[PDB]
Amino acid sequence: PPGPPGPPGFDGRNGEKGETGPP
Amino acid sequence: PPGPPGPPGFDGRNGEKG
Amino acid sequence: PPGPPGPPGFDGRNGEKGETGPPGPPG
What we know:
- The structure is a homotrimer.
- By secondary structure, chain A is mostly loops.
- In chain A, about 0% of the residues lie in helices and about 0% in strands.
- The N and C termini of chain A lie far apart (about 65 Å).
- Chains A and C meet through loops of A and loops of C.
- It is classed as cell adhesion.
- Keywords: human collagen type III, cell adhesion.
């Protein structure tokens, strides 16, 4: 019989800080 | 037979606005 | 017997870099 579903994937890394605004 | 694939992870959260 | 579990799910992609902030107030 078919087995059960595989383990869930991991979520991706959070994107990196937005860049500073200019003066 | 081996089961179906695990579900995909979610894409990462976006970066905070500057 | 009923089969073993499936393969690991794929991982999500990296998140996008955030928005550049706006320019500062005049001096």
